[PDB]
Amino acid sequence: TSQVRQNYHQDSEAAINRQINLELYASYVYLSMSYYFDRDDVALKNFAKYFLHQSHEEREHAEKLMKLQNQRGGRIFLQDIKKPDCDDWESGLNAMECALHLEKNVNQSLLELHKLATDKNDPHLCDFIETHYLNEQVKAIKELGDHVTNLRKMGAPESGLAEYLFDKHTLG
Amino acid sequence: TSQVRQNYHQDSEAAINRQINLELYASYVYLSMSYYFDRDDVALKNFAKYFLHQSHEEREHAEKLMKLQNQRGGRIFLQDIKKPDCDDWESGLNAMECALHLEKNVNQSLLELHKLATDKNDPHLCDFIETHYLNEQVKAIKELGDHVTNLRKMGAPESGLAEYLFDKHTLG
Amino acid sequence: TSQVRQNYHQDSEAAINRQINLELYASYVYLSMSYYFDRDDVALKNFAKYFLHQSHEEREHAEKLMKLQNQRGGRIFLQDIKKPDCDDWESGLNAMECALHLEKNVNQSLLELHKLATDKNDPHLCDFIETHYLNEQVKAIKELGDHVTNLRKMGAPESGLAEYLFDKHTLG
Amino acid sequence: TSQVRQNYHQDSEAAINRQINLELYASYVYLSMSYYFDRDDVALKNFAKYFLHQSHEEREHAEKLMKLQNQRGGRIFLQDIKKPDCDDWESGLNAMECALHLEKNVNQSLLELHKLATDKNDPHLCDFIETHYLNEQVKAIKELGDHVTNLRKMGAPESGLAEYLFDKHTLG
Amino acid sequence: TSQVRQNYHQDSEAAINRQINLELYASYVYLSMSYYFDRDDVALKNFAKYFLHQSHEEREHAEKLMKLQNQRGGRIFLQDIKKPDCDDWESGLNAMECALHLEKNVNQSLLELHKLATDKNDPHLCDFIETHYLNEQVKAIKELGDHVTNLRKMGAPESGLAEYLFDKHTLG
Amino acid sequence: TSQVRQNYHQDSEAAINRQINLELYASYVYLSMSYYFDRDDVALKNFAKYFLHQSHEEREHAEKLMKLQNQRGGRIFLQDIKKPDCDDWESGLNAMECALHLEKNVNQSLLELHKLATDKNDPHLCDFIETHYLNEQVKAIKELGDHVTNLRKMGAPESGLAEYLFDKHTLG
């Protein structure tokens, strides 16, 4: 038992480790998407930049969770980071939709974590989640939804012109 | 077949994918070490900072390999990132020794890759490896060896005072 | 025999002269393309600027090869610079494709030169080629492939709007 | 027929294409001279610099003629650029004399072009030639004559000391 | 055996020690030449400055080789530095010619070292040699050849005026 | 006989040449010590820096003696620079003690030189020695004695911690 541990439940520790793995997996997926868009037969540099930035932010979130785990006296237990489902994301619109799905999954996991923390009467963990993850996920989901809506209205994925102009004007 | 592909062998493509996975694994290991040293019962902030920086550099090396793969017309195929062997690295000296072992393994993989590229007559890949990875690995191995030697002479791992002073003076 | 000549094979000298002629020819071709796009019935000023810049860079590469030839004690022997195959390049997409073909030809010639230098045990010439030409050619080929992919996706050469928007947004 | 073409005779268009080829040939000759003086057994860096600058200026003149051809609605038709007559220019004095001869040839071609433009009643072409080429050629011929006179008085080509001091003091 | 040693052959270690001795010897020779030209009956301050600078650069190269030897886990074994062949270098032209001969000898030794490293499959050592020594030797040999050519053309060693003017204008 | 020579004895000339050789030998020894401390199994960067600086200062003293020899009309006669006695200096304390011994030897040689100059009635040489070498040697010997005393009191060579802390605090 850690000397700093106080009001930190074992269930909360396990949930934090699971969330760490999920954030690392999201970072891996975003990296895969970015370098799909760096391909010579896709060539959407601003899509690639956007997804690389998302990957870096995801890794930062994982590091913040690890820092919280060390702060509360828990012990980090790392697991394998599974590879992304696809190697070819087939379009900017499809990548945006998959990113929206992934962010909604991450948000649902965070909501389950907050529910568990509320059940265990861990106000510090609850406020940590609320302050650092919930609103960030809400804004990320809203932004991805806006991007998907705009791409659909311009006519993606059939319109390479639509994807090109979105890359230049919205992501540039 | 990619429109930009020229003098790029399938064996080289597969070896580059393997090296990408190895660099990502090294990044994961360094992250594990850093947050082991962030623990309340270890509390070596400069060890943690050093290993976090190593993890970021490993990320950058993996991303550079992915960029090279896209440049040469190859296709990136990501695999699972295996978890690190240990959760508890037991000391600064032990972590330094394991990092030295890992860097020597990475250097050996890079040397095998250079040998394969020389066999396949890929001077661009050979020069890429020589310019961006071989000397960096040599300096990293030399630095880790220096750190291990200094820790042993000061009397680690038995001397918490030795580890504390090394953290303050060499890593600070 | 030059007083500075050392480990410089006659085959290498002849290959360097051939490469000088090839670089000058590439410069001529790029100049032709640029002033095709300066025509009143084409009027793509950013295409013209891009190809003029490529012509200048090709000239610089030829001058660097001549400097290397003088450095190693060889003697420069200039030949006729053949005219470009076409006077009318018919579209931005067609010009981009022909430029990609030309850069791949130049890269293949450079790879043959590196193979000859390796056979003749000329590490200085090998490293000169690797440092100054191979990665530049790889990046140029990747960039041209990206441009061709983007033009095709926007719908060139049928879409004058696609060529106009590419000229403004990617080349501007 | 171009939509911008007005008072531009076919004879003038052909003469402009011929002048473009002549300017490119002069650039090639000056490049040859510069890298002759870059040789280890000649080693006159300021002669080499002077002739390289002349080559760049000749290329600029050719590009200006191509721009004029596009402005007047003519069509550029590029020809082979013949190699220079000599590979070895034998001295600074001999190179200066050959450059003077070449500039006089270029000036005579420009005067014939101006005569043709006057015959065809093309005041725009006449004024273009007068503004951009005739006085530049006159000044270049005067400068080359001054250089030749000075080299002869100092005692070139017999006096390597004369050529060295001219390189340092006049061309430096 | 050093803890950092990897893919470093004993033959390569011995060759590196030999090259260290050769670079130190070259530094000694250049120092001798510089202070020959500092003599009251020679009095060529810019020749002395040039050769002193060459001596400093030679020692820097020796130190870089020693650093490489420590980096790769080899052990430096220093030998006697033999005295230069002559105490009186008899002229600026003769000193320049002897320096050219010495640089060609050093370049040949470096080429033999690169051949040995290629045979032992040591890409790091090969790239180290290519990056830090081969092109420097090529430029140094070219510069010395240019100096010798210029001195001969001005009429050295018979012309003390030629040596004086070369000292002032080329080396000043 | 030199035109500038005045009141300069042949014995003084020979003694100056001997002192030049001694200073060069001291520079060589200090270089050996510095790169011993650059080894991966020693790893004392500040010891290495200190001894490299001492080697450079020894270079400068040798060059100043050569300058004096040229000033007084003497002729420099260079000899072989013998290798240092040891390749392994075994500790910071042992290296400091050997450096103290070497500086005392150099000081004794300088005192013998001053005695000879006084005997030959060479006040310029006497004052040159007094101004540029005697007080520097006294200060260097005092500094080395202080370093040896401090290392012994901290407990070197048994205490790698003592050597590490001395490297950080006194030499850093």
Ligand code: NA
């Ligand atoms: Na994937």
Ligand code: NA
């Ligand atoms: Na979802």
Ligand code: NA
């Ligand atoms: Na782990």
Ligand code: NA
């Ligand atoms: Na290893």
Ligand code: NA
């Ligand atoms: Na190994």
Ligand code: NA
């Ligand atoms: Na053409």
Ligand code: NA
């Ligand atoms: Na091609």
Ligand code: NA
């Ligand atoms: Na090819």
Ligand code: NA
């Ligand atoms: Na590129």
Ligand code: NA
């Ligand atoms: Na020629």
Ligand code: NA
């Ligand atoms: Na003429």
Ligand code: NA
């Ligand atoms: Na005439």
Ligand code: NA
């Ligand atoms: Na000598």
Ligand code: NA
């Ligand atoms: Na030689």
Ligand code: NA
């Ligand atoms: Na030694």
Ligand code: NA
């Ligand atoms: Na002594």
